[PDB]
Design a protein around this ligand. Structure first.
Ligand SMILES: O=C(Nc1cnn(-c2cccc(C(=O)Nc3cnn([C@H]4CCNC4)c3)c2)c1)Nc1ccccc1Cl
Length: 342
């Protein structure tokens, strides 16, 4: 009779359509609680994310709304696509929660980073991240907050980016991961498309090192890790900084920066075959072009895709895919509800 049923998953109640059976928790990426389920209508496994009262504050509201809208502005195999969107509540007055449904993936990228991967798997994951970012850029979306916890993969090495990045205070206990953010985001500079290349560089570097490249309590410690490893940026970079941040940056101790063979030694890559010796030099060369502080000198998405380490996967069909304010709680609730009801 009723088209919904309720189940307790962890500490959260999931009220879902009856088509979704055998709900099991599969973690929390960023914006909510996520379950694996069997979809009896599509005869396939799915992942279901619950957004609880997303209109409760500005931060949750802005993100929930912009991601509901942006899903319809994208259509690419390396970017999240929803199978379903629903609410069990019947009216705007009763409206509480949003449920998002997508295909069930096999792991988060954080899990994948911890494994020893061959060059074929690493270059294919990076290639897909680049195809996904190029698709976003072509749709007018510059991410600025790409990180492994928002990236999922299947056993066949297939990859999807789950979020749309940056558009502020959280009263909840969950903290933000800033380690993959570009110097332009760290230093409040103004940016272009290749702001996302830095994040790809941070991910690739961590795949090789098995340690976060630029950790820190906040941007102070993080900036120190950047300059310790890559060296103090050029005076040409300094000129593009706002006066106060420029004074801060110019007054930090000056660092020469370590070379890329020192940063990513031969021991981190397989040295068995001539094939792997060459792939190691190409991987390090790509790292040296992505992990560059000054965006005027960092490689573009299009040049990264033409790089010999990545280009082996290049497919025009996968790269040339045709691309199609402040509010109160009350206002955000209706904006979100309207997107949910379409
Ligand atoms: O985080 C997500 N989506 C998402 C997808 N898949 N995964 C994921 C991540 C980590 C692990 C797993 C995992 O455990 N998958 C697993 C379990 N079982 N199976 C096989 C094996 C046997 N038959 C089923 C496979 C899934 C996470 N957010 C999201 C969800 C729905 C809509 C919108 C959003 Cl942003």
């Amino acid at each position: 009779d009723n088209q919904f049923y309720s189940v307790e998953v962890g500490d959260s109640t999931f009220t879902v359509l009856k088509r979704y059976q055998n709900l099991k928790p599969i973690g929390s990426g960023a914006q909510g609680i996520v379950c694996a389920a069997y979809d009896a209508v599509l005869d396939r496994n799915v992942a279901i994310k619950k957004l609880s009262r997303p209109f409760q504050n500005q931060t949750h509201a802005k993100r929930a709304y912009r991601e509901l809208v942006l899903m319809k502005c994208v259509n690419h195999k390396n970017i999240i696509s929803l199978l379903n969107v629903f609410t069990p509540q019947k009216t705007l007055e009763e409206f509480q929660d949003v449920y998002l449904v997508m295909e069930l993936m096999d792991a988060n990228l954080c899990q994948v980073i911890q494994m020893e991967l061959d060059h074929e798997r690493m270059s294919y994951l990076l290639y897909q991240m680049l195809c996904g970012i190029k698709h976003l850029h072509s749709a007018g979306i510059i991410h600025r907050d790409l990180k492994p916890s928002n990236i999922v993969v299947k056993s066949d090495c297939t990859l999807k980016i789950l979020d749309f990045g940056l558009a502020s205070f959280m009263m909840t206990p969950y903290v933000v991961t800033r380690y993959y953010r570009a110097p332009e985001v760290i230093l409040g500079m103004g940016y272009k498309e290749n702001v996302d290349i830095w994040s790809v560089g941070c991910i690739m570097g961590e795949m090789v090192r098995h340690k976060i490249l630029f950790p820190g309590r906040d941007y102070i410690d993080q900036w120190n890790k950047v300059i310790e490893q890559l060296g103090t940026p050029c005076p040409e970079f300094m000129k593009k900084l706002q006066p106060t941040v420029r004074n801060y940056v110019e007054n930090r101790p000056k660092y020469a920066g370590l070379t890329f063979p020192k940063l990513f030694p031969d021991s981190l890559f397989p040295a068995d075959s001539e094939h792997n010796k060459l792939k190691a030099s190409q991987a390090r060369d790509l790292l040296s072009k992505m992990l560059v502080i000054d965006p005027a000198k960092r490689i573009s998405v299009d040049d990264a895709l033409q790089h010999p380490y990545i280009n082996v996967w290049y497919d025009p069909a996968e790269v040339e895919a045709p691309p199609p304010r402040e509010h109160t709680i009350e206002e955000w609730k209706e904006l979100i509800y309207k997107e949910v009801m379409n």
